[PDB]
Design a protein around this ligand. Structure first.
Ligand SMILES: [Mg+2]
Ligand SMILES: [Zn+2]
Lengths: 277, 49, 49, 79, 1350
DNA sequence: CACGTATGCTATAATGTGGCAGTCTGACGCGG
DNA sequence: TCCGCGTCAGACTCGTAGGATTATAGCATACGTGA
């Protein structure tokens, strides 16, 4: 009843040939010259090596099979850049490549947000330092304590420990059992409440009515500047493009429109009422 | 009162305008349901009048 | 449940035959559970874990 | 009425149609600003329509007949 | 957008590509530093859209001016951010991937299509084994699995000219190559030649699948995924929490799994990797996609961060929590509030106290609106700040808005429709909601901290529907039974009782007054008690033949108090209503009477008045509790010491030898049970009465005014049962096993229980409390199954004009008529001009609503049986007619067309169950004189002279003079009758005695007794006694029995002196009585029996407690049509029968009809004994066997009204045992929904052929056009569906999916290419549209006619 | 050029995996 | 057909409180976009 993808694959690997030293040399010389069968046999025979390191690389990020596959990618590069001319054995060289490719994949696929290996490597040293500090300081490392030990900036240490924070699941509930999910607590913020949206509809509507209440030449340069009626939000000097074509007269008329409108808000009943807002 | 996004704002404006008219729409939960069924690879279409 | 042995019995339940099938359960504090049970045909069976 | 709507159900019959007809009439007064046949007496558009139905002034058929009349008057004016 | 229907079908690879706006190649979400979407990642802006409204990613185009302007540099469209919730993407899979839903979901479509077992397909998919796709050389045919080694063999020998492959590529090829047409014809050819019974079903099912596959235009290849769709970002969001951290959907983790492994597969293919590694990656890819679609179905679900399995796509749709049940069939709602409830006795029935601050908030837009029309607010934000400041003018405006505006109050749980009611709100200072007392019944509201939801109907339409349909005042009668729920209790009833109740003389006995006003003046003056018996002059107003009221003046012998209550009583009512001492039971009748005579507004005013007077006089009295209130019987210890020495004597006799544990258990329980009743009766005879009142001279006896007695007798609160354990004896307590403790609790609550009595009490108490928590949920699950099945049922037509009618008889069970025929046919349309005895003049017409007046006429004439029009027999297709249903019990008049009847039915059956969550029957004694009538009875005369019954179904009736049936009495088997058939008995005579414990096996013939097959240890057991040695035999059943005796039936056989078999009078049957489980025979073999003797005593243990815990499973079993283990046999067709073959003892009853020459032959168990004997002309459905009947068999042979009446009566038995009144018509609705579908034989002009299951309405429609035009006639047969299946058989898949089993429903609909036109209510509620019922029926019928043109 | 981000390469031999589910329960089908 | 793992179900609102963990080497050569 062998149904499990893992046990099936490990069955297939066991069913391979194990290679010797002189056999590795014969196959490796044929392999680099570009043999089909030599490449396949060297890879298939050394799969067991991938698994032994892949089994001791679990419970960190991906699953056993996931690590086994990426480790196998290391085996391929190892067979490609193996030197049979050097008297030294293959297993030693391959171990490097398999560990390299597994580690690199574990640094990328695990972190939900793609993080650079540069920041990750720095982080490693910060964490190792924390370990040594923890053994002697019965408490745990402060950011400042770590920064003093590496002779590096407090700000830089804090930035790094800020990228270490793991992501929480929103689909996962909090209220004891399954009473409410994090999704149902957390509201859509970029989206305004209907009360806020309706308030903007009233200001915009009021502006249209406020535009047909002042002077015809006082709401032709006050709105075409702010981009209220116009298409583009211009500045005091840029209102000259239309018909105004002035710098002094535009600035006097902008503020003249606002002063008469300030009295329109003092009389309707806003001014200091709508100052808090 | 719930999902209909356009509907809730429009009816709020009507109630301040004193119109007391509904103008209903389509609940956003249903739009999601459709997207979640298409994400399964089932074609679920609205057939028009 | 205290570790030790327990001798229990489905009072009917299984088989409208209505046979009382006796069972032993050995419960450790840590380890796999060791079950012994009877079958309608009076054959003694072991379930490991 | 004010308290209970039994009498207005007895005029039209179907509770469901009572609600549609009272709705349609209340909408006229709400939007069109149609004048109420009974004194308002500080009553909401919902209750006034029910008064008018109780007394037997408002009805699906009557409302339809006057809709045609105002609509034909407007056709006359446009042509 | 406004659409007609919805269809579901399999997604083509190319279809999936259409929705996609790009291929997501990378797992990259966003950049860690600029938290913006990565290149071609899962949140890519280039694919799903811009993060911010009308703004590209690199920021070159901003503002609403730039519209659809795809930025050249970054590649991001300038549109709204909303698009990222709607745009989809896709993924190019390297290997084809099977879609779990069509593979694993049972039965499965891929397997059923290939006719290939799942096991075979899986071996192929996980790359364990090759499958042959096609070999021209028949050497290897099709779908034949080859192992790794099997593939090497044929590959050398044949090779090339045979194609066998592995993985999903293989299955996709196998699906592509398969020709749907040709296999359809081949399978039709197979059914023609040799149709084997069980494999005809499976072949017809694959034929239906193939046909439906071709009609849908779905292609089998598409079951395997080449392109994989990607859900829009906002529907799987990555958002920043306040803490700086991010939080994301699990779909992101599952998509990242799939993309990583897919891209790695692309890599390993580019690199030409060895095939073992390619295979592993293809397995892992299929694992990741299957986890993404439906995690946990494909075995062990992928655990994320905590250990909890990741929530997949299907999990967001499926579960109760999915999207259907949680976000679509119910929602959280705006303009909603809640708070604690508290009394508002001052309120009128149509009002409720609504806290100021709560109402301020709920009506915010309505305030803003009036503020701007008065010009007090310049704009909305200024209006908001005026409300924030809570200015004095704002309160005055808020008062003005709330005027005549109804608010909905809701209490959980909402079991039935009255759990929501509308009120006119009354603004109150303080934070608690004030509820009117009289509606507390409907809500099941008690003010020990309950809370209520408030909801504001916004539209004019919603306001009107609240005021007219949902208003408190307008929902007085319950939707279930005609009896109303609105009725005061507690203090209100207590005060009315005190006043009404009259005491001896008191102040001013036997005075005379001018009307109730002199009485009131006398009482308030302090010259008269309310209980003074004095004659007053009152003028009652009785209605005449027309609308005019007649006035009548007469002297009445009542009390001061009742006269003063007459003042509240409206004109129309008789004075006799107030002349009794009033309780809650009498006041409910008073308000119902007033409603049916005078009408709604008068009863409304009268109800308020009753509440005001009731409270007012309730505080004027001042009864309470104490320590002496609970009177203890003086002769309690005398009955305790007697009972106690008695039980002691039997315990000493136990060591002697007359007693088993079971016998003494029964004897001690009987002694204590009788002692308890004795002490309770004496306690109730020293409390109810025992009032020495010296009347005006000498002593009298009258009713006690002891406080607790008045509370109980009035029905205000506690019952006699609660007072049994208060001042009386606590009684026998029952263990959690249900077996009763031998020592009862003689001490009560007043005297104080001992540590042991208290400890023993605990068991029952806690099981009660645990029952409320746990059992509520099965009750509620039944409500929900009922609701789903009867959602569609709506009143569609006024009169179908059918004469069909369910003949309803009077429920006269257990002497006293349980439910009268009058009340059973009250408010139902009559069928067939049914006049009086003398057939010569019509009394009643046809379709005529039975009003209380018609019903009163029926009682003078004493009509027993009436065919009435029923929902089940209604001809209306796609709903039911107002006439077949009858009165809306909640309204008190004919049902309105458009009312959603099914929902009301389901709610009204469901509610009581959810809310609700003496075995001395030895002798029948007859109450009234008459003659014994025994229907269905076959008894043998014993040597005593006495008629010993040996029938199973026996009905003793009591006929009077005229010849009506008035009392019934179920006589059992093994009974001694005092008198035989048609003999006169007097009042209070015993007519039959039987033992309740032990159903004896009574022999018909006389002779000697023989032990057949009764081997000791094999089949029976032997148990021996001392000195002489009495052995007793117990029949061990197959449960305790050895393998050896399994096949042997043990039976006491009657032989004569010669030792030949004695025959049963006049038949070929030799006497032999088959002994069941534990049949305890005393008398050992060879004992001369006389006839009519007790052979064997089977023990009848009745450990069942009369509660809804045991009743509801019976109700659920009836509604779901659960076939019993021993179904009752019935006659299929009419005709004359003789016996043929026998298997040892097993009967092969052979029916050979008179006209119909074909026989019908049945195999029958040996031990099952027949009611019929041999050659009788029996009709369709004559009862042959003893045992419970399957509703299926009833429908199939007798028909609709038979099976409907069986369900109605068997369900109603349970509810009636708990005192629950539900009208039959509700049960009838749901049975109609059960009998929705029908199987068809033969073809018509449509596509019926053999055994398609189609709905009854649609086949009737076909039959109507067929009969007019002709074509091939189609025989049909109605099928019964039990609730769950009936709801899944509905031709709306949106209702089927929302109900249950959503994954399976959507695969079957997707493969059929099914189209839902949104006919039902659930369907319309899901899309958020107008219901096709109530208000919506007008609008919905207008849309249906818009389908005819424009 | 440069900062951030990525791919790269190292040689004693080493070459088949392994943390829980705690038996819920009546119900109703789909292979042997 | 029958013993048997498999798969699908198990009232309605209110509340409370926030939330976790692990470790992946040192170094140089490299590819990508803005100034
Ligand atoms: Mg109570
Ligand atoms: Zn750009």
């Amino acid at each position: 009843r062998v149904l499990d993808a893992t046990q099936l694959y490990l069955g297939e690997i066991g069913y391979s040939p194990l290679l010797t030293a002189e056999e590795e040399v014969y196959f490796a010389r044929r392999a680099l010259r570009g043999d089909v069968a030599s490449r396949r046999r060297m890879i298939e025979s050394n799969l067991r090596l991938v698994v032994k390191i892949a089994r001791r690389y679990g419970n960190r990020g991906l699953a056993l099979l996931d690590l086994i596959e990426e480790g196998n990618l290391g085996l391929i590069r190892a067979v490609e850049k193996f030197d049979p001319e050097r008297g030294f054995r293959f297993s030693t060289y391959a171990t490097w490549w398999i560990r390299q490719t597994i580690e690199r994949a574990i640094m990328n696929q695990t972190r939900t947000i793609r993080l650079p290996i540069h920041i990750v490597k720095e982080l490693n040293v910060y964490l190792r330092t924390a370990r040594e500090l923890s053994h002697k300081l019965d408490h745990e490392p402060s950011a400042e304590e770590i920064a003093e030990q590496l002779d590096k900036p407090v700000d830089d240490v804090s930035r790094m420990l800020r990228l270490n924070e793991r992501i929480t699941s929103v689909d996962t509930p909090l209220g004891g059992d399954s009473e409410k999910a994090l999704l149902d607590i957390l509201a859509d913020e970029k989206e305004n409440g209907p009360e806020d949206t309706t308030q903007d509809d009233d200001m915009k509507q009021s502006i249209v009515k406020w535009l047909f209440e002042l002077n015809a030449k006082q709401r032709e340069v006050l709105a075409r500047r702010f981009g209220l009626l116009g298409y583009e939000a211009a500045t005091l000097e840029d209102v000259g493009r239309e018909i105004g074509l002035t710098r002094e007269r535009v600035r006097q008329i902008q503020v003249e429109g606002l002063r008469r409108l300030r009295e329109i808000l003092q009389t309707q009943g806003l001014n200091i009422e709508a100052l808090f807002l | 009162k719930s999902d209909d996004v356009n509907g809730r704002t429009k009816m709020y404006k009507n109630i301040v305008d004193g119109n007391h008219q509904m103008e209903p729409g389509m609940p956003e939960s249903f739009n999601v349901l459709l997207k979640e069924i298409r994400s399964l690879g089932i074609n679920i279409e609205l057939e028009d009048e | 449940r205290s570790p030790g042995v327990f001798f229990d019995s489905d009072k009917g339940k299984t088989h409208s035959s209505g046979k009382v099938l006796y069972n032993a359960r050995i419960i450790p504090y840590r380890g796999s559970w060791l079950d012994f049970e009877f079958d309608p045909k009076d054959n003694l069976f072991v379930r490991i874990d | 009425a004010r308290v209970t709507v039994q009498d207005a159900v007895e005029k039209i019959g179907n509770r469901f149609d009572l609600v549609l007809v009272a709705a349609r009439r209340a909408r006229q007064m709400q939007v069109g600003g149609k004048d109420p046949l009974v004194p308002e007496e500080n009553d909401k558009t919902t209750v006034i329509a029910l008064r008018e139905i109780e007394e037997g002034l408002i009805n699906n058929q009557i409302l339809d007949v006057r809709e045609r009349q105002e609509q034909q008057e407007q056709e006359a004016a446009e042509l | 957008e406004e659409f007609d229907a919805i269809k579901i079908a399999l997604a083509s690879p190319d279809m999936i590509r259409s929705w996609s706006f790009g291929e997501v190649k990378k797992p990259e979400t966003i950049n860690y530093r600029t938290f913006k979407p990565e290149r071609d990642g899962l949140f890519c802006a280039r694919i799903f859209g811009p993060v911010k409204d009308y703004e590209c990613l690199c920021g070159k185009y901003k503002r609403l001016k730039h519209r659809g302007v795809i930025c050249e540099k970054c590649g991001v469209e300038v549109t709204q951010t909303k698009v990222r919730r709607e745009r989809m993407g896709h993924i190019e899979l390297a290997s084809p991937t099977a879609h779990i839903w069509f593979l694993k979901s049972l039965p499965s479509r891929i397997g059923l299509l290939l006719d290939m077992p799942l096991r075979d397909i899986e071996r192929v998919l996980y790359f364990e084994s090759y499958v042959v796709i096609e070999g021209g050389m028949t050497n290897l045919e099709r779908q034949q699995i080859l192992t790794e080694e099997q593939y090497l063999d044929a590959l050398e020998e044949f090779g090339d000219e045979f194609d066998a492959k592995m993985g999903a590529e293989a299955i996709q090829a196998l699906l592509k190559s398969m020709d749907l047409e040709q296999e359809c014809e081949q399978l039709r050819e197979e059914l023609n030649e040799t149709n084997s019974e069980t494999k005809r079903k499976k072949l017809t099912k694959r034929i239906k699948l193939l046909e439906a596959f071709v009609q849908s235009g779905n292609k089998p290849e598409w079951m395997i995924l080449t392109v994989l769709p990607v859900l829009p970002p906002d529907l799987r969001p990555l958002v920043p929490l306040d803490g700086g951290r991010f939080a994301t959907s699990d779909l992101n983790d599952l998509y990242r799994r799939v993309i990583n492994r897919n891209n790695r597969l692309k890599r390993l293919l580019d690199l030409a990797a060895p095939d073992i590694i390619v295979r592993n990656e293809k397995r892992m890819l299929q694992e990741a996609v299957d986890a993404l679609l439906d995690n946990g179905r494909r075995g062990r679900a992928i655990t994320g961060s905590n250990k909890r399995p990741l929530k997949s796509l299907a999990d967001m749709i499926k579960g109760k929590q999915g999207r259907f049940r949680q976000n679509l069939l119910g929602k959280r709602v705006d303009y909603s509030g809640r708070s604690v409830i508290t009394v508002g006795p001052y309120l009128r029935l149509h009002q409720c106290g609504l806290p100021k601050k709560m109402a301020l908030e709920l009506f915010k837009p309505f305030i803003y609106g009036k503020l701007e029309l008065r010009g007090l607010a310049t704009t909305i934000k200024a209006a908001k700040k005026m409300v924030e400041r809570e200015e004095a003018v704002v309160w005055d405006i808020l008062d003005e808005v709330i005027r005549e505006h109804p608010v909905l109050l809701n209490r959980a749980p909402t079991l039935h429709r009255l759990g929501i009611q509308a009120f006119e709100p009354v603004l109150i200072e303080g934070k608690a909601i004030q509820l009117h007392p009289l509606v507390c019944a409907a809500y099941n509201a008690d003010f020990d901290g309950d809370q209520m939801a408030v909801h504001v109907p916004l539209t004019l339409e919603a306001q009107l529907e609240a005021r007219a349909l949902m208003m408190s005042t307008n929902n007085i009668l319950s939707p279930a039974n005609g009896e109303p729920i609105i009725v005061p209790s507690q203090d209100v009833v207590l005060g009315l009782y005190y006043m009404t109740r009259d005491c001896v003389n008191a102040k001013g006995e036997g005075m005379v007054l001018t009307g109730p006003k002199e009485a009131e003046r006398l009482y308030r003056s302090g010259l008269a008690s309310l209980h003074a018996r004095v004659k007053v002059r009152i003028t009652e107003y009785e209605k005449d033949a027309n609308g005019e009221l007649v006035a009548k003046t007469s002297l009445k012998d009542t009390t001061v108090g009742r006269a003063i209550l007459w003042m509240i009583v409206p004109k129309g009512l008789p004075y006799s209503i107030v002349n009794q001492a009033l309780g809650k039971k009498a006041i409910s009748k008073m308000l119902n009477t007033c409603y049916r005579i005078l009408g709604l507004k008068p009863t409304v005013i009268f109800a308020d008045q009753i509440m005001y007077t009731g409270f007012a006089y309730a505080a004027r009295s001042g009864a309470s509790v104490g320590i002496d209130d609970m009177v203890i019987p003086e002769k309690k210890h005398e009955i305790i010491s007697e009972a106690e020495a008695e039980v002691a004597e039997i315990q000493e006799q136990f060591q002697s030898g007359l007693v088993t544990a079971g016998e003494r258990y029964n004897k001690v329980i009987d002694i204590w049970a009788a002692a308890n009743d004795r002490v309770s009766k004496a306690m109730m005879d020293n409390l109810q009465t025992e009032t020495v009142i010296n009347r005006d001279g000498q002593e009298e006896k009258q009713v006690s005014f002891n406080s607790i007695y008045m509370m109980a007798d009035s029905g205000a609160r506690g019952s006699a049962a609660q007072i049994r354990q208060l001042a009386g004896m606590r009684g026998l307590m029952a263990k959690p096993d249900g077996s009763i403790i031998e020592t009862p609790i003689t001490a009560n609550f007043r005297e104080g229980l001992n540590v042991l009595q208290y400890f023993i009490s605990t068991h029952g108490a806690r099981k009660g409390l645990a029952d409320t928590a746990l059992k509520t949920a099965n009750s509620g699950y039944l409500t929900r199954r009922l609701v789903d099945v009867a959602q569609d049922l709506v009143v569609t037509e006024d009169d179908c004009g059918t004469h069909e009618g369910i003949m309803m008889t009077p429920v006269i069970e257990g002497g006293d008529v349980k439910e009268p025929l009058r009340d059973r046919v009250l408010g139902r349309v009559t069928a067939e001009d049914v006049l009086k005895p003398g057939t010569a003049d019509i009394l009643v017409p046809r379709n005529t609503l039975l009003h209380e007046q018609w019903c009163d006429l029926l009682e003078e004439n004493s009509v027993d049986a009436v065919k009435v029009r029923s929902v089940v027999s209604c001809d209306t297709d796609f709903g039911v007619c107002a006439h077949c249903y009858g009165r809306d019990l909640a309204r008190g008049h004919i049902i309105n067309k458009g009312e959603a009847i099914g929902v009301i039915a389901a709610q009204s059956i469901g509610e009581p169950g959810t809310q609700l969550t003496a075995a001395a029957e030895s002798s029948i004694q007859v109450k009234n004189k008459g003659s014994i009538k025994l229907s269905n009875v076959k008894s043998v005369v014993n040597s005593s002279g006495k008629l010993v019954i040996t029938s199973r179904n026996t009905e003793l009736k009591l006929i009077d003079e005229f010849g009506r049936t008035k009392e019934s009495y179920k006589v059992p088997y093994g009974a001694v009758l005092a008198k035989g058939d048609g003999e006169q008995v007097a009042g209070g005579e015993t007519v039959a005695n039987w033992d309740p414990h032990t159903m004896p096996v009574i022999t018909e013939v006389s002779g000697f007794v023989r032990f057949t097959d009764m081997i000791d240890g094999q089949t029976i057991t032997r148990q021996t006694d001392e000195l002489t040695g009495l052995s007793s035999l117990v029949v061990l059943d197959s449960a305790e029995r050895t393998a050896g005796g399994k096949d042997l039936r043990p039976a006491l056989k009657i032989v004569d002196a010669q030792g030949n078999d004695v025959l049963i009078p006049g038949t070929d049957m030799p006497a032999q009585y088959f002994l069941p489980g534990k049949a305890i025979v005393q008398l050992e073999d060879g004992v001369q029996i006389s006839s009519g003797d007790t052979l064997a005593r089977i023990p009848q243990e009745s450990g069942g407690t009369k509660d809804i815990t045991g009743g509801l499973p019976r109700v659920a079993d009836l509604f779901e049509a659960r076939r019993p283990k021993e179904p009752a046999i019935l006659a299929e067709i009419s005709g004359i029968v003789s016996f043929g073959k026998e298997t040892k003892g097993k009967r092969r009853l052979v029916i050979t009809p008179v006209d119909g020459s074909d026989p019908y032959e049945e195999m029958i168990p040996k031990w099952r004994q027949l009611n019929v004997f041999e050659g009788e002309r029996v009709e369709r459905g004559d009862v042959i066997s003893d045992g419970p009947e399957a509703p299926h068999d009833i429908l199939r042979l007798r028909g609709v009204h038979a099976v409907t009446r069986y369900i109605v009566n068997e369900v109603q038995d349970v509810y009636r045992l708990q005192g629950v009144k539900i009208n039959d018509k509700h049960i009838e609705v749901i049975v109609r929904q059960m009998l929705r579908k029908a199987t068809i034989v033969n073809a018509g002009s449509s596509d019926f052929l053999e055994g398609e299951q189609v709905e009854y309405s649609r086949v009737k429609i076909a039959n109507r056009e067929l009969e007019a035009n002709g074509k091939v006639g189609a025989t049909y047969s109605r099928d019964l569906l039990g609730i769950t299946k009936a709801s899944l058989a509905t031709e709306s898949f949106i209702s089927a999916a929302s109900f249950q089993e959503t994954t399976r429903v959507l695969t079957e609909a997707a493969v059929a290419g099914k189209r839902d036109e949104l006919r039902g209510l659930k369907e319309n509620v899901i899309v958020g549209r107008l219901i096709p019922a109530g208000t919506g029926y007008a609008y919905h019928q207008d849309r249906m006619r818009r389908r005819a043109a424009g």
